[model samples]
Target: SMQPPIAKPGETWILQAKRSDEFNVKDATKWNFQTENYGVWSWKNENATVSNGKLKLTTKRESHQRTFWDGCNQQQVANYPLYYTSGVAKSRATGNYGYYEARIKGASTFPGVSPAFWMYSTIDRSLTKEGDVQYSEIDVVDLTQKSAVRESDHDLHNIVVKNGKPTWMRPGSFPQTNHNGYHLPFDPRNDFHTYGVNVTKDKITWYVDGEIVGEKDNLYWHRQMNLTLSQGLRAPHTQWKCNQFYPSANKSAEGFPTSMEVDYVRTWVKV
Candidate 1:
């Protein structure tokens, strides 16, 4: 029985039960633990846990030979010496044009990590046609873990087909939207705060601790998305530098085994 933190005037919100969860226990039926490597790290089921009413996605320093199919590269990355593992929980139910919120604490690691609450969609390219938008993403918040910067990130992404090619509208979309809208007076890593996004056809508004922090035009974010909570190993800062999959060098595991703890995730649509 979860609801939106604040309701808009004249709008009654209907909570999406299957798309929402109060993490009493890690509901495997509600979420899928992603067991894949991203950038210089890997993801395993063991790295994500539910205990004490929170869903914890952990980042740990571990040595393992990881292999995953790089979908963008169209080849299997073989025998990669992966030095770390992280956790991410993806909802099985697709969400779009709704309000999504979660109580989140950013990862404890500093300088090289980020905790994210976001959504993404993927489509098979073989079935894709020209002018079809095959990919869409929305980052409600990518909490800052940089030593020099305190601003968190909110961004959008879309990949459209142009003559049978998946072309990114803006690979790093710095040109559109008010992207960096969080300069928290409090540490998100140390305390829990309500982070959310109210997404509609014409607009997407991001909120932190119940305050509207950023707003963007919902230009190409219409595809259904899987709600995701994941901790990331950042190279420099937690900005959406999408070049995490194939780093030429290794990542420092100095601040390993940190987590993005979630008390609950709630979703609603205006009924």
Candidate 2:
């Protein structure tokens, strides 16, 4: 048998595109879409919209208002609204044991914003038994606030649990500087890039612009994980960590209309 020819360094192999469906509210089975239960899960007309060829998640001064039901103490506060409208879409079926990924872009500055492309277990939340959170939940990517001097810095972590004990790991720290970092390298506000996660029975990896930034393969916890794309407002939980406020006029060009633009989202399961 002939030995395989060695390819030059930096050479690569590209897989053919797999078919995926675009999610919308009208499709019930495809999307388990609802904004009634979340602390702050609703749509903002001017700031957030999916049209033409992309889904834009922004925080500009507009007539748009976010809808959320405050559940801090399990109370309903419908009239009191937040300042953002992060979109969330997921598959209705329980995707237990497979590969999943999301192509995403992050924003520059809007103070306390929590934009992420992640997944959670279908049985993670329930009013009946505290939802058994540990059995199913994962934070693939979470871009929070930045420090005073470090303008483009954000925290990153991966978590897993079997019987409710955390199996957490932190991939090296990231900075909001040039395009060579782990987290959002560019001002994703202007352009779009693919952020992906590859998960299996034994391992899970995080990818930015096709580069592997983080990975883990030890134990098991979640079986059925689903997709979700959301932009969160500045709240008590995210406020201290991520500054949630609009930038001064001097910081940005536009004053009242900024958002995280998502060109499209798709996932695949290895056959």
Candidate 3:
């Protein structure tokens, strides 16, 4: 069992019981299976399952004729031709300035798919400034699929609204921007590894199996963010960019039906 974190100097870490889950059974109120469709892929609630003490999110090449609120094209389509489907578990609660951790094993089909543990805001426009950022994201770990093996992407995003449209300001420059990629000593696909992030008023810290991997000055991530466990296709298969329409991947068709498994997700608020 993963133990509770030790309190920092002159600080207390209170575990948010309602948000933390062991995935022993399906908690109907805990998470919502994201049911939106991108271009080539869609999300089905059945693709995510809780059994044998773990949460498994599977990706498969199955054609499903279902009603998908087309997130990319901004239209509601009935019986869309969704060739691929995957799983996503999104938390119902939003939290901020907390220590978040999860034990995850990336999909076996690496270099193509990404098993992600991340957090982001809902982007209420009332909280927006025209030329400035209105959305924020914190990737605790998007398990290695981009540059090379034994590396994980721990990045941040400050999204801005320009002329009534959302735009990714950084646009992924890698090493040139806040693309905090860290080399891991072990392959996360082989076994379950702990991925963590400590987000505070001053800085954000990233961890792999309790080891600090990266850190950055906290400038934009202060809003209450929703926790999400998701897996999606990545680069080389199609020209899609940054969190929106990345339904294409650099993997082969034989890698279909691969899964990203999670042992547990836990969080503690700073007090």
Runs of candidate 2 with Cα error greater than 4 angstroms are: 1-19, 22-29, 36-48, 58-84, 122-134, 148-184, 218-220, 235-256
Clashes of each: 0, 17, 0
Candidate 2 lDDT, tens digit per residue, 122-147?
43323123222334444556655443
Ranking, lDDT, top scorer first: 1, 3, 2
Looking at model 1, residue 96 earns an lDDT score of 89
As for model 1, its CA RMSD to the true structure in angstroms is 2.9
Residue 247's lDDT in candidate 2: 19
The sequence of per-residue lDDT tens digits that candidate 3 reaches over residues 1-271 is 2345635567766788766899998776878787444545778899899989999999887766666455557767787554567899888888878889999988988666789999888766664556666778889998866678687789888766678775664427434446687889998899999999988899888888888888888766877788889988666444553345533434356778899999999998865
Worst 10 residues of 1 by lDDT: 236-245
| Clashing pairs in model 1, backbone N/Cα/C closer than 3 A | none
For model 3 the local lDDT of residue 100 reads 92
For candidate 1, give the lDDT of residue 257.
Answer: 72
